[PDB]
Tab-separated table of C-alpha atoms in Angstrom:
chain	number	residue	atom	x	y	z
R	1	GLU	CA	-5.460	-7.059	40.600
R	2	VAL	CA	-3.991	-4.608	37.466
R	3	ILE	CA	-5.579	-7.743	35.329
R	4	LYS	CA	-9.027	-7.699	35.936
R	5	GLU	CA	-11.622	-10.649	35.174
R	6	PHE	CA	-12.623	-8.734	31.777
R	7	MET	CA	-10.102	-6.346	30.309
R	8	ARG	CA	-10.249	-4.676	26.898
R	9	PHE	CA	-7.400	-3.362	24.825
R	10	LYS	CA	-6.224	-1.036	22.230
R	11	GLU	CA	-4.081	-1.910	19.402
R	12	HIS	CA	-2.053	0.235	16.959
R	13	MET	CA	-0.113	-2.028	13.920
R	14	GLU	CA	2.033	-0.215	10.977
R	15	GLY	CA	4.246	-2.212	8.610
R	16	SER	CA	4.437	-3.350	5.158
R	17	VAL	CA	3.964	-6.425	3.300
R	18	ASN	CA	5.697	-6.665	-0.410
R	19	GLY	CA	6.506	-2.789	-0.627
R	20	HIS	CA	3.048	-1.832	0.390
R	21	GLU	CA	2.683	0.147	3.665
R	22	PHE	CA	-0.858	0.495	6.079
R	23	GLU	CA	-1.712	0.945	9.518
R	24	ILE	CA	-4.337	-0.635	11.382
R	25	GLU	CA	-6.301	0.066	14.634
R	26	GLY	CA	-8.471	-1.903	16.779
R	27	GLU	CA	-10.283	-2.158	20.410
R	28	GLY	CA	-10.898	-5.732	21.964
R	29	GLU	CA	-12.352	-7.049	24.947
R	30	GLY	CA	-11.834	-10.067	26.675
R	31	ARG	CA	-11.477	-12.677	29.918
R	32	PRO	CA	-7.432	-12.600	30.690
R	33	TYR	CA	-7.856	-15.927	32.977
R	34	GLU	CA	-10.228	-18.192	30.504
R	35	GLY	CA	-8.013	-17.052	27.467
R	36	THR	CA	-10.619	-15.473	25.582
R	37	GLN	CA	-10.751	-12.470	23.627
R	38	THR	CA	-12.300	-10.312	20.784
R	39	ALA	CA	-11.749	-7.649	18.544
R	40	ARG	CA	-12.640	-5.250	16.037
R	41	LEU	CA	-9.986	-4.080	13.456
R	42	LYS	CA	-9.693	-1.291	10.745
R	43	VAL	CA	-7.308	-0.449	8.081
R	44	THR	CA	-6.886	3.215	8.685
R	45	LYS	CA	-3.878	4.065	6.213
R	46	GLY	CA	-3.415	2.337	2.978
R	47	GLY	CA	-6.374	0.256	2.700
R	48	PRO	CA	-7.296	-1.957	0.727
R	49	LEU	CA	-4.469	-4.335	1.779
R	50	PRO	CA	-3.451	-6.490	-1.489
R	51	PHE	CA	-2.545	-9.590	0.812
R	52	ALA	CA	-4.186	-12.178	2.827
R	53	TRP	CA	-5.673	-10.614	6.094
R	54	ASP	CA	-4.634	-14.007	7.609
R	55	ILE	CA	-0.818	-12.899	7.815
R	56	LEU	CA	-1.674	-10.162	10.299
R	57	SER	CA	-3.966	-11.512	12.391
R	58	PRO	CA	-1.369	-13.481	14.378
R	59	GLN	CA	0.149	-9.895	15.175
R	60	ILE	CA	-3.070	-8.876	16.585
R	61	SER	CA	-2.511	-10.430	22.722
R	62	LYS	CA	-0.794	-13.281	25.008
R	63	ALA	CA	-1.966	-11.694	28.387
R	64	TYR	CA	-4.834	-13.521	27.513
R	65	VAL	CA	-3.744	-17.267	27.764
R	66	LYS	CA	-5.504	-19.373	30.410
R	67	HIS	CA	-2.889	-20.828	32.749
R	68	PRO	CA	-3.115	-23.203	35.666
R	69	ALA	CA	-1.698	-22.428	39.025
R	70	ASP	CA	1.463	-24.487	38.595
R	71	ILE	CA	3.012	-22.975	35.320
R	72	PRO	CA	4.000	-19.076	36.058
R	73	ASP	CA	1.801	-17.077	33.897
R	74	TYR	CA	5.072	-14.649	32.822
R	75	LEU	CA	3.409	-12.241	30.570
R	76	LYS	CA	0.361	-11.576	32.803
R	77	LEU	CA	2.868	-11.080	35.647
R	78	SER	CA	4.836	-8.179	33.845
R	79	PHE	CA	1.866	-5.864	33.817
R	80	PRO	CA	1.231	-3.363	34.635
R	81	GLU	CA	4.689	-2.231	32.766
R	82	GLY	CA	4.471	-5.201	30.558
R	83	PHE	CA	6.211	-7.070	28.000
R	84	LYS	CA	7.903	-6.962	24.390
R	85	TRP	CA	7.698	-9.602	21.344
R	86	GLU	CA	9.564	-10.139	18.484
R	87	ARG	CA	8.815	-13.315	15.984
R	88	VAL	CA	9.537	-14.523	12.523
R	89	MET	CA	7.361	-16.694	10.352
R	90	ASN	CA	9.025	-18.579	7.465
R	91	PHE	CA	6.411	-19.551	5.042
R	92	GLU	CA	7.012	-22.602	2.703
R	93	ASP	CA	7.209	-20.521	-0.579
R	94	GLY	CA	9.804	-18.214	0.977
R	95	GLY	CA	7.752	-15.193	2.176
R	96	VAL	CA	8.930	-13.680	5.631
R	97	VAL	CA	7.247	-11.982	8.367
R	98	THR	CA	9.032	-10.226	11.192
R	99	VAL	CA	7.247	-8.370	14.012
R	100	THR	CA	8.148	-6.095	16.760
R	101	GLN	CA	5.499	-5.627	19.521
R	102	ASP	CA	5.078	-3.212	22.430
R	103	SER	CA	2.540	-4.508	25.471
R	104	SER	CA	1.697	-2.353	28.513
R	105	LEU	CA	-1.309	-1.210	30.508
R	106	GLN	CA	-2.484	2.406	30.276
R	107	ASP	CA	-5.929	3.808	32.194
R	108	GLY	CA	-7.416	-0.024	32.913
R	109	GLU	CA	-6.732	-1.316	29.506
R	110	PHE	CA	-3.985	-3.239	27.524
R	111	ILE	CA	-2.249	-0.831	25.209
R	112	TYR	CA	-0.586	-2.872	21.595
R	113	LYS	CA	1.843	-1.586	19.419
R	114	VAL	CA	2.652	-3.316	16.510
R	115	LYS	CA	5.210	-3.157	13.614
R	116	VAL	CA	5.427	-5.715	11.041
R	117	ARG	CA	7.402	-6.450	7.979
R	118	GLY	CA	6.719	-8.652	5.168
R	119	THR	CA	8.762	-9.374	2.141
R	120	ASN	CA	9.869	-12.101	-0.651
R	121	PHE	CA	6.198	-13.097	-1.080
R	122	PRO	CA	5.247	-14.621	-4.221
R	123	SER	CA	3.171	-12.570	-6.713
R	124	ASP	CA	1.322	-15.516	-7.671
R	125	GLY	CA	0.876	-17.053	-4.055
R	126	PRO	CA	-1.584	-17.572	-1.624
R	127	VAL	CA	-1.048	-14.436	0.066
R	128	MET	CA	-0.743	-11.672	-2.438
R	129	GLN	CA	-3.553	-13.600	-4.310
R	130	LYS	CA	-5.871	-13.590	-1.179
R	131	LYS	CA	-6.589	-17.237	-1.301
R	132	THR	CA	-6.019	-18.321	2.101
R	133	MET	CA	-9.043	-19.119	4.027
R	134	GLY	CA	-7.851	-18.931	8.183
R	135	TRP	CA	-5.228	-20.829	10.301
R	136	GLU	CA	-5.718	-24.306	11.604
R	137	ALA	CA	-5.357	-24.439	15.478
R	138	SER	CA	-1.927	-24.242	16.545
R	139	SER	CA	0.232	-25.687	19.599
R	140	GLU	CA	3.215	-23.481	20.760
R	141	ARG	CA	5.847	-25.379	22.556
R	142	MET	CA	6.993	-22.631	25.200
R	143	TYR	CA	10.384	-22.811	26.800
R	144	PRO	CA	12.797	-20.431	28.807
R	145	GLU	CA	15.920	-19.432	27.202
R	146	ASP	CA	18.288	-16.772	27.801
R	147	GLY	CA	16.371	-14.789	30.468
R	148	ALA	CA	13.306	-14.876	28.122
R	149	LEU	CA	10.289	-17.090	27.153
R	150	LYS	CA	10.602	-18.392	23.491
R	151	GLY	CA	7.943	-20.041	21.132
R	152	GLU	CA	8.370	-22.276	18.491
R	153	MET	CA	5.747	-23.827	16.062
R	154	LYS	CA	4.522	-24.577	12.819
R	155	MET	CA	1.262	-22.879	11.841
R	156	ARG	CA	-1.067	-23.828	8.783
R	157	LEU	CA	-2.881	-21.389	6.896
R	158	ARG	CA	-5.926	-23.109	4.947
R	159	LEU	CA	-5.973	-22.620	1.182
R	160	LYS	CA	-9.774	-21.858	-0.777
R	161	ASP	CA	-8.712	-24.699	-2.772
R	162	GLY	CA	-8.777	-27.462	0.204
R	163	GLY	CA	-5.231	-27.488	0.928
R	164	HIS	CA	-2.649	-26.052	3.233
R	165	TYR	CA	0.196	-23.731	3.307
R	166	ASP	CA	2.806	-23.903	6.100
R	167	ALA	CA	5.042	-21.387	8.243
R	168	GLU	CA	7.646	-22.106	10.932
R	169	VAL	CA	7.370	-19.632	13.710
R	170	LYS	CA	9.588	-18.516	16.644
R	171	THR	CA	9.134	-15.985	18.658
R	172	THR	CA	10.754	-14.355	21.912
R	173	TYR	CA	8.585	-12.616	24.660
R	174	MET	CA	10.459	-10.492	27.250
R	175	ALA	CA	9.278	-9.150	30.294
R	176	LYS	CA	9.878	-5.639	31.088
R	177	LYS	CA	10.983	-7.188	34.393
R	178	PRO	CA	12.448	-10.260	35.411
R	179	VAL	CA	9.286	-11.725	37.048
R	180	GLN	CA	9.155	-15.927	37.401
R	181	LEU	CA	10.120	-17.630	34.307
R	182	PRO	CA	8.129	-20.890	33.708
R	183	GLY	CA	9.405	-24.150	32.627
R	184	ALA	CA	8.664	-25.830	29.373
R	185	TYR	CA	4.733	-26.069	28.236
R	186	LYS	CA	2.512	-25.744	25.606
R	187	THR	CA	-0.331	-23.325	24.403
R	188	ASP	CA	-2.863	-24.918	22.300
R	189	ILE	CA	-4.209	-21.250	20.569
R	190	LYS	CA	-7.291	-21.299	17.769
R	191	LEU	CA	-8.082	-17.873	16.287
R	192	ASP	CA	-11.005	-17.397	14.173
R	193	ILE	CA	-11.684	-14.279	11.626
R	194	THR	CA	-15.673	-14.109	12.869
R	195	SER	CA	-16.419	-11.060	10.367
R	196	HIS	CA	-14.886	-8.984	7.551
R	197	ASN	CA	-16.232	-6.668	4.707
R	198	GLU	CA	-15.482	-7.401	1.355
R	199	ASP	CA	-11.949	-5.670	1.289
R	200	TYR	CA	-10.957	-6.852	4.652
R	201	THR	CA	-10.379	-2.671	5.551
R	202	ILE	CA	-12.956	-3.668	8.611
R	203	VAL	CA	-12.581	-7.379	10.598
R	204	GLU	CA	-13.456	-9.126	13.888
R	205	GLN	CA	-11.348	-11.965	15.481
R	206	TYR	CA	-11.817	-14.190	18.063
R	207	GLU	CA	-9.090	-16.311	19.826
R	208	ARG	CA	-8.888	-18.800	22.372
R	209	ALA	CA	-5.414	-19.802	24.270
R	210	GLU	CA	-4.671	-22.296	26.885
R	211	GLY	CA	-1.150	-23.359	28.359
R	212	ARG	CA	-0.695	-26.977	29.677
R	213	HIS	CA	2.186	-29.246	30.524
R	214	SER	CA	3.442	-30.828	27.524
R	215	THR	CA	2.121	-34.358	28.256
R	216	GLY	CA	-0.910	-34.483	25.368
């Protein structure tokens, strides 16, 4: 009942990557039970960014994941109060992103507050040289641990070049109340940058996400 078949969200993000501070705001919309969403983002402080938008796009919404009836939808169950998540991305060239995030449901809309910290990206690497070209589809391995929901995956960035740039990704999702943890499952995710201005101070994204048992 609080999560309708159509839901909007608002997002604020603050952080820094290799010493460069920024803020981003966005508005989005999607169909939480179909696993689909779009958003319009803008850089509100510290634009233009000297690094690849691609490292921020996965930090920009797990209430929008289609779940079968027989896998508890822990993150939807957490609303209206919501959940927090924390993430580390270890990139193959020593770059690291850590994230902390709050999600809640206020005045009929999801509210996201994100804090992103990137460091140790090589100055001549594809991130700081803006030579990435979006994520391959990812398959997140979900499992309950220590009273929380954990996800682990290898994410693959495409390079302008024709090769790949990997990150090992670990996330912990913690509902604000102890709503039902699921068992082990997979979430297939694909995120697209669908529009942007020249300097990526204005950007649109689409994501589709679907949970399924870990059988193929």
